[model samples]
Target: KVVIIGAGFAGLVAARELQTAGIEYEILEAKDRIGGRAWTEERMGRPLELGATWVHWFQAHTWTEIMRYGQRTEITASPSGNDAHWVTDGKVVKGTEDDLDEKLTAAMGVTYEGSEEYFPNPHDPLWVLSDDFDGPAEVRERFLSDDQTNAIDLVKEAGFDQETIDLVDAFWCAGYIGDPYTGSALMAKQWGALSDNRYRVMEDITLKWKLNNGMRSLYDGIAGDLNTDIRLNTPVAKVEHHDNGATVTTESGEVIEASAVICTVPVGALSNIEFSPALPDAVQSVIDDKWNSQGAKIWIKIKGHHRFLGYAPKPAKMSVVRSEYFMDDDTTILVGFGYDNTNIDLNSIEDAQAVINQWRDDLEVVDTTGHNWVADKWAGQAWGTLRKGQFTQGWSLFDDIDSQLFFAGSDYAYGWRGVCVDGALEKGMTTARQVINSMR
Candidate 1:
């Protein structure tokens, strides 16, 4: 028997693999729903995505899974295009779509490419440099020996003005890793190489799409096909590993025993749970050093707005705002990226309202509704910042410490760093195969 925890994409995909392998399994989820971070809610008779909302067709793993589940792709408005505007230095920079693209491309260093070997299979140790390094000391030694200052210089050479750099950094930090400057440069380089050195992966490189109904549709479809027993709102409090199998204890005091357990909870939530005999020293270290991203998407109902405008601050600066548009509607969504380290009090709606108002004066602001992820308890400790050192340390340490335990989540993804649906699906599918092969 197999027990899967969390029921997000990772757990769901693992359960599917187990089912195909003719293995019996049970899915345990702390939340009442199965979508995890990919959830949708109904607000004022319209579907609002609380978690993930977009994907790129070039993101094969996620798109393939969506297709397999009988889901159709929906074409949405591109946030940056010919019909865009920019706000910088308290000025509205009105320009043609082409000009905006050129500026953005220039700001992001579109033509810059990292080491030719950076695109090697993400799981391979050669590209990841995982075999020789163990901790920060070893990672620094390898970095100094390799003399990898060229890549950093390339990033600097990318024609990003100071303002544009802040905007790009804040956008990527909030959109991807949740923490800026603290995220792994190695991971960033890997993604940068995959994108062919493009700044925004969606614009220069991939075809983007979203679910018309919501991202939850895909999760619901996957959940409907599963025959496994699922328990929702049942958070696991502890896991006791033994020679024969493992026993999982929920917060409710109900205990479950299974031959094998696949733990799919996010690293942020892992610290709260107790593990008898404890995890390995290395595994525990990684868990303790978990990184998280601070993200919040504000949906504003507009009275009349033809175009969407955005402002990006410098890296490590949380004041930058990126603009996004939804399917033909009077509503405009602005994704605000910041770091938990900034110590900004986002809990107060008034504070959020004030920021949105300032941003609008520079761009466009109507009525606003805020959704803050940093305030959530399940968000974990680190808040997804990949410092310059994390990319090498985190990826190298991602493999499971003990054969009996497995780890899978967006935080563990090697390709697209941060919290993207594509990254999440990729991590899930890869971990599923590993677990299946181990069982075989």
Candidate 2:
């Protein structure tokens, strides 16, 4: 039997695929619930997506499951073609969504113009994985390199005005868990392309739609289809891999030996599990280094709804805010992402109400709640990120797959590598195929 660790997007989908193939398997999820970082928890008496949210048709993998499940989705906005601005205190700088999108696209075009040639196949990110395939000396320097290049520097390389750079950085940095000026430019570039918002980098780049009932059903539906051998609340303590097979020991000391184990745990949570005989320095460095993927998110209950969307630069407390949903009370819900706990107070109702009114005078907040993905051990960080020089340098190390051991996650994806839910599905389903092939 295959030991599928984690019940997040990757693990659950792995279970689903393995079951579809009639392969014997079991899932060991550390959390009492599945969905890992893709949590849709009910807080403040409303369904608020604490983890991965939003999807579009261009994201083929996750969309496949959404369509297959016949789930409901509604079109949303990432700021509007109309209702958008950059706010500082009570002051707002208006930028119509379409006009700003035009400026953003034109500016970003300079950086991504050669992207198609460099990454001809977005899905096959490893196409030029071999340096034996070097770019022409002249234009090679222009290519997305494994240098300590800052995203801010790359965006500035496009020669946009300071205003353009600020808004673009504000939009991307909020989603990026690491330091914007210090993180990878390759990360920012791919972030735009992977989400299908290559040019129109606005409030909602990944997609303009969200699930109506929440993402819980999407995960539970997959788990519900798995074999009864699934085990929740079972955190694997150690994984002993050998030529013959492997033994997975849980925190409670229960050991399950299987011909192969597909470990889909998050990068931030990997060091917790001891590997027998130790893993290579390359893979081990990733775990020991501690991914820079840490951030905070909060949802505020709006007393009165305002359609305005606001963005603040990196140094600013709140990075991005959106007028999210219409609650049962007729008040709208707004979701905001920030760098850290210092960025916003999730539990303080007073601060939230003030911040709400400050963002848009027309809106007021009665209460506030949120998810601290960083504090949550299950999710050691908000989401994954590819740091400067890390992508082209170390991304391929994760491509290693063995018959006895396997690694998978959004972090390991070649194309839709990070911050996207479908990337998780891709890694999960891909690993399932590899595991099944070994079984065959």
Which is the leading candidate under lDDT? 2
Clashes (candidate 2): 1
Question: Tens digit of lDDT per residue, candidate 1, span 22-50?
Answer: 87889889877787777787752367665
**Residue 81 of candidate 1: its Cα lDDT?**
55
Sequence-dependent TM-score of model 2: 0.90
State each model's C-alpha RMSD to the native. 4.5, 2.8
lDDT of each: 0.59, 0.72
Error of 1 at 80 (Å): 4.3
Give stretches of model 2 more than 4 Å off: 72-82, 87-92, 131-141, 144-147, 192-197, 201-205, 328-330, 351-363, 401-403
Clashing pairs in 2: 78-204
Off by over 4 Å in 1: 77-97, 107-112, 122-160, 200-207, 314-335, 340-353, 362-366, 381-385
> What are the per-residue Cα lDDT tens digits for candidate 2 across 1-43?
7898898999999888888989888899898888988988888
